[PDB]
Design an enzyme around this catalytic site. Sequence first.
Site, PDB file in Angstrom:
ATOM      1  N   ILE A 160       0.847  -1.057   0.028  1.00 16.86           N
ATOM      2  CA  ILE A 160       0.050  -0.151  -0.049  1.00 16.86           C
ATOM      3  C   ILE A 160       0.824   1.177   0.107  1.00 16.86           C
ATOM      4  CG2 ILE A 160      -1.692   1.352   1.412  1.00 16.86           C
ATOM      5  CD1 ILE A 160      -2.513  -1.654   2.339  1.00 16.86           C
ATOM      6  N   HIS A 190      -2.815 -10.818   9.030  1.00 18.99           N
ATOM      7  CA  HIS A 190      -1.377 -11.594   8.590  1.00 18.99           C
ATOM      8  C   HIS A 190      -1.240 -12.833   9.073  1.00 18.99           C
ATOM      9  CE1 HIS A 190       2.659 -11.738   6.819  1.00 18.99           C
ATOM     10  NE2 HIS A 190       3.045 -11.958   8.328  1.00 18.99           N
TER      11      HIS A 190
HETATM   12  C1  LIG Z   1       3.751 -12.439  -1.220  1.00 18.30           C
HETATM   13  C2  LIG Z   1       2.328 -12.028  -0.801  1.00 18.30           C
HETATM   14  O1  LIG Z   1       1.386 -11.044  -1.627  1.00 18.30           O
HETATM   15  N1  LIG Z   1       1.500 -12.686   0.055  1.00 18.30           N
HETATM   16  C3  LIG Z   1      -0.008 -12.376   0.256  1.00 18.30           C
HETATM   17  C4  LIG Z   1      -0.706 -13.642   1.101  1.00 18.30           C
HETATM   18  O2  LIG Z   1      -0.581 -14.705   0.072  1.00 18.30           O
HETATM   19  P1  LIG Z   1      -1.935 -15.874   0.417  1.00 18.30           P
HETATM   20  O3  LIG Z   1      -3.257 -15.085   0.047  1.00 18.30           O
HETATM   21  O4  LIG Z   1      -1.895 -16.356   1.668  1.00 18.30           O
HETATM   22  O5  LIG Z   1      -1.755 -16.913  -0.816  1.00 18.30           O
HETATM   23  P2  LIG Z   1      -0.384 -17.715  -1.179  1.00 18.30           P
HETATM   24  O6  LIG Z   1       0.214 -17.159  -2.507  1.00 18.30           O
HETATM   25  O7  LIG Z   1       0.750 -17.910   0.222  1.00 18.30           O
HETATM   26  O8  LIG Z   1      -0.869 -19.280  -1.179  1.00 18.30           O
HETATM   27  C5  LIG Z   1      -1.921 -19.484  -2.211  1.00 18.30           C
HETATM   28  C6  LIG Z   1      -2.488 -20.722  -2.036  1.00 18.30           C
HETATM   29  O9  LIG Z   1      -1.694 -21.752  -1.934  1.00 18.30           O
HETATM   30  C7  LIG Z   1      -2.146 -22.738  -0.753  1.00 18.30           C
HETATM   31  N2  LIG Z   1      -1.044 -22.576   0.176  1.00 18.30           N
HETATM   32  C8  LIG Z   1       0.224 -21.627   0.285  1.00 18.30           C
HETATM   33  C9  LIG Z   1       1.100 -21.672   1.253  1.00 18.30           C
HETATM   34  C10 LIG Z   1       1.339 -22.838   2.137  1.00 18.30           C
HETATM   35  O10 LIG Z   1       1.839 -22.884   2.966  1.00 18.30           O
HETATM   36  N3  LIG Z   1       0.090 -23.962   2.158  1.00 18.30           N
HETATM   37  C11 LIG Z   1      -1.281 -23.739   1.106  1.00 18.30           C
HETATM   38  O11 LIG Z   1      -1.985 -24.621   1.110  1.00 18.30           O
HETATM   39  C12 LIG Z   1      -3.314 -22.197  -0.281  1.00 18.30           C
HETATM   40  O12 LIG Z   1      -4.677 -22.547  -0.917  1.00 18.30           O
HETATM   41  C13 LIG Z   1      -3.348 -20.827  -0.825  1.00 18.30           C
HETATM   42  O13 LIG Z   1      -4.466 -19.990  -0.685  1.00 18.30           O
HETATM   43  O14 LIG Z   1       0.324 -14.140   2.097  1.00 18.30           O
HETATM   44  C14 LIG Z   1      -0.103 -12.866   3.180  1.00 18.30           C
HETATM   45  C15 LIG Z   1       0.351 -13.391   4.344  1.00 18.30           C
HETATM   46  C16 LIG Z   1       0.548 -11.649   2.636  1.00 18.30           C
HETATM   47  N4  LIG Z   1       0.443 -10.720   3.278  1.00 18.30           N
HETATM   48  C17 LIG Z   1       0.100 -11.244   1.177  1.00 18.30           C
HETATM   49  O15 LIG Z   1      -1.463 -10.649   1.425  1.00 18.30           O
END
Ligand SMILES: CC(=O)N[C@H]1[C@@H](OP(=O)(O)OP(=O)(O)OC[C@H]2O[C@@H](n3ccc(=O)[nH]c3=O)[C@H](O)[C@@H]2O)O[C@@H](C)[C@H](N)[C@@H]1O
Length: 190
Positions: A53, A69
């Site tokens: 942001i 988070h």
């Molecule tokens: C770099 C960035 O911008 N991150 C976003 C956000 O990412 P996220 O929204 O959580 O999705 P991520 O890319 O990690 O995963 C996508 C899909 O993969 C699966 N999955 C993934 C990892 C895991 O250990 N196990 C699992 O099962 C699951 O289905 C998940 O939905 O993380 C936040 C903490 C950040 N604040 C930010 O908002």
Amino acid sequence: GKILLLGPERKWLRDFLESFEDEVTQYQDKLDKKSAILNNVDFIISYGYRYIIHPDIVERFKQRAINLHISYLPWNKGADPNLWSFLEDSPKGVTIHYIDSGLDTGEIIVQREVTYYENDTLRTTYERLTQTIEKLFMEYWPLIRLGKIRGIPQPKGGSYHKLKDKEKYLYLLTDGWDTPVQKLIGKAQN
Ligand SMILES: CC(=O)N[C@H]1[C@@H](OP(=O)(O)OP(=O)(O)OC[C@H]2O[C@@H](n3ccc(=O)[nH]c3=O)[C@H](O)[C@@H]2O)O[C@@H](C)[C@H](N)[C@@H]1O
């Protein structure tokens, strides 16, 4: 009030926020600082937003912007927190915090430790983190919404990762998110 949800659209969350008779808009693309999307917004909630942001927006929404988070802050600020919490064998959990300049460094409103078990995978732990933080948000949003709540300063320390930091460890993830975590504990240490 008017709430801006930054991140993906989620029906349960829209319905929850709208149940308080607030007006809800959602956006997940890059947000220019002069964008009309912010016109008359009263509160920002980010959950899953993939862009940083703009600082001018952060300052404009001091004490009116929170982030959901899925790490136990101050550990695993930034990217892939669940993965890193096993690679670096760190505290595990979820945190709701005010957004301040910089990358997941703002004041902690509430957090919760999340445990893991025999046979857990990156998928089962991530889904547990997700359920935990969503229930915690539902418990506290009534207070946050009324300014009935303040944070405590997030301690400096913990850890911070960028998306690319995990590249040298992807070969461990032979089953993708179904990789058992036990195989990963402490692999980024020593
Ligand atoms: C770099 C960035 O911008 N991150 C976003 C956000 O990412 P996220 O929204 O959580 O999705 P991520 O890319 O990690 O995963 C996508 C899909 O993969 C699966 N999955 C993934 C990892 C895991 O250990 N196990 C699992 O099962 C699951 O289905 C998940 O939905 O993380 C936040 C903490 C950040 N604040 C930010 O908002």
